[PDB]
């Protein structure tokens, strides 16, 4: 059941402005819920504040599209 | 498991240009696959050809977003 959800997560994150790919995604089931941790690429010339905004937008987009996700941490790396 | 998928189907169809709501949706599991039949509302002043285009765009959008769907029939009604 996980591969389909992971695809949806990647797809949803990569649609958000400022995301330069999903570098890392670890998702696991906690019962019927998904808990996930993600790293996104961002432009090295974005400010840290902008990167933080992009992370927050990813969290909103992904959580909004995939209802079973109950925890999602997003961080950023220069790419 | 079905309610989540039906939500995704409605949501995906209602995002397509020219769709004036999902009037009817019957979805059923055939094993792990979904087979569905849908009626969408359309502007009574669209041509039949335009309605046919909108139906085809709905089928593409829904099938593209929901991988488990293996059959989807879409028709249109004036609304
Ligand atoms: Cu903030
Ligand atoms: Cu045609």
Curated annotation (Swiss-Prot), chains A, B:
UniProt effect for mutating residue 48 to W: Significantly reduced magnetic response, many fewer, much smaller magnetite crystals formed, still stabilizes MamB, CTD dimerizes, binds fewer cations
Residues at which Fe cation 1 binds: 37, 73
Annotated stretches, region: C-terminal domain (CTD): 3-79
Free-text disruption phenotype from the record: Single gene disruption has no growth defects, no accumulation of magnetite, forms empty intracellular magnetosome vesicles, decreased levels of MamB, mislocation of MamC in 1-3 foci or rarely in a shortened chain. Magnetosome vesicles are fewer and smaller, aligned in a chain with the filament, only a few have very small crystals. Other, possibly precursor magnetosome vesicles are visible. MamI mislocalized to cell inner membrane or in 1 to a few patches.
Annotated binding of Fe cation 3, by residue: 77
Outcome recorded upon mutating residue 52 to A: Wild-type magnetic response, no change in magnetite crystal size, number or shape. Significantly decreased magnetic response, many fewer, smaller crystals in vivo, isolated CTD does not bind cations
Upregulating conditions: Part of the probable 17 gene mamAB operon.
Function of the molecule: Essential for magnetosome formation; required for stable accumulation of MamB. May nucleate iron crystal formation. Probably binds and transports iron. Binds divalent cations, possibly up to 3 Zn(2+) per dimer in vitro, probably iron in vivo. One of 7 genes (mamLQBIEMO) able to induce magnetosome membrane biogenesis; coexpression of mamLQRBIEMO in a deletion of the 17 gene mamAB operon restores magnetosome vesicle formation but not magnetite biosynthesis.
Complex and partners: Forms homodimers via its C-terminal domain (CTD) in the presence of metal cations. Interacts with MamB via their CTD. Isolated CTD forms homodimers.
Entry's family note: Belongs to the cation diffusion facilitator (CDF) transporter (TC 2.A.4) family.
Miscellaneous comment as given in the Swiss-Prot or TrEMBL entry: This bacteria makes up to 60 cubo-octahedral magnetosomes of about 45 nm in diameter which contain membrane-bound crystals of magnetite (Fe(3)O(4)). Expression of just the minimal mamAB gene cluster (MGMSRv2__2365 to MGMSRv2__2381), including this gene, is sufficient to form a minimal magnetosome chain with small magnetite particles.
Domain notes: The C-terminal domain (CTD) is probably responsible for hetero- and homodimerization; it assumes a V-shaped, dimeric metallo-chaperone-like fold that can open and close. Val-48 forms the hinge between the dimers. Binds up to 3 divalent metal cations (probably iron in vivo); upon binding there is a conformational shift to a tighter dimer. If the CTD cannot fold correctly the function of the whole protein is decreased, suggesting the CTD confers functionality on the transmembrane domain (TMD), perhaps activated by ligand binding to the CTD.
Protein name: Magnetosome protein MamM
Organism: Magnetospirillum gryphiswaldense (strain DSM 6361 / JCM 21280 / NBRC 15271 / MSR-1)
Top-level taxonomy: Bacteria, Pseudomonadati, Pseudomonadota, Alphaproteobacteria, Rhodospirillales
